Amino acid sequence: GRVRTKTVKRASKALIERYYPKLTLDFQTNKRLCDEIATIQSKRLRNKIAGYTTHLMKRIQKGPVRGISFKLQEEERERKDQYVPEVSALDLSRSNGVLNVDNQTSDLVKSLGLKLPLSVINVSA
């Protein structure tokens, strides 16, 4: 069971989250990348990190794996303000300017003493 230690996972994951496009599918160039871009004191643990960058780069070029990319939270902030329909369902133009409503609710509005466009569609049980 070759479970990668926490330092290799976190370092390789960070080097792909921040520094994605420099990294490649090849171990021998990502190894030189990990030589040049992080201060890893030992060649062996650098090879661990570099081959795990290679494996995760093989995984991410198939689909977006759950890393860090701060380009979508602002789009979700925009998504709150995107779908503002210009005609609401509360707007009378959806129902030809009239409120289709029952006899008792019309009796309520008559008791209010307020004049609104109302069409009395009766219901029963």
Binding site: L90, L92, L99, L112, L116, A125
Partner: protein, 206 residues
């Protein structure tokens, strides 16, 4: 202690009739039969929307009574109320708690979820029941948006609406939001309709 400026608007009444806020629950509790207008023959009761309006007016008065606008907290575990509460608190200055309520948020002075409100506003007192029970320990008033079979334990001023239809919920939060802002002074004229549509407070899904 109210001018006739505060009275019910024909535009707002058209809005409230369009949102089916008048369509009350099937069964009605003991303490909310004052809010019932009548029962339709299909078993749906009718909510006195004028009473509803003046309850929103008094609730807006109470929200105006808190000096610092941060101690006002809106609450929703209701799905549509999440949208409504977030956009409400955006336009208001209050703080929202959408989704799941963390217990011990009003007790437990140590944790990071520790907030000190001076007012709690609730979409559904049945879905947000634990927030009512939590507010019942640290002396916080509770404003609720009660349908006609909503439980009225530990509640202050309660607004009769329909918590089923999302248009009703978004519009109730909408009207309370605009009336609070008109009472503050950022909406100086009363003749002015609130320019943001009630569709910003309604809930969407792709």
């Amino acid at each position: 202690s109210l001018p006739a400026t505060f009275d019910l608007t024909p535009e707002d009444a058209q809005l409230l009739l369009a949102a089916n806020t008048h369509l009350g629950a099937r069964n009605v509790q003991v303490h909310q039969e004052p809010y019932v207008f009548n029962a339709r023959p299909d078993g749906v009761h009718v909510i006195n929307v004028g009473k509803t309006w003046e309850k929103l007016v008094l609730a807006a008065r109470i929200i105006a009574a808190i000096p610092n606008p941060e101690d006002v907290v809106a609450i929703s575990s209701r799905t549509f109320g999440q949208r409504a509460v977030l956009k409400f608190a955006a336009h208001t200055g209050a703080t929202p708690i959408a989704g799941r309520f963390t217990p011990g948020s009003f007790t437990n002075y140590i944790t990071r979820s520790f907030k000190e409100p001076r007012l709690v506003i609730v979409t559904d007192p049945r879905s947000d029941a634990q927030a009512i029970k939590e507010a019942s320990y640290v002396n916080i008033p509770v404003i609720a948006l009660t349908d006609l079979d909503s439980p009225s334990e530990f509640v202050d001023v309660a607004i009769p609406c329909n918590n089923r239809g999302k248009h009703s919920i978004g519009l109730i939060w909408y009207l309370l939001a605009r009336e609070v802002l008109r009472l503050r002074g950022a909406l100086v004229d009363r003749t002015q309709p609130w320019s943001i549509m009630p569709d910003l407070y309604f809930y969407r899904f792709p």
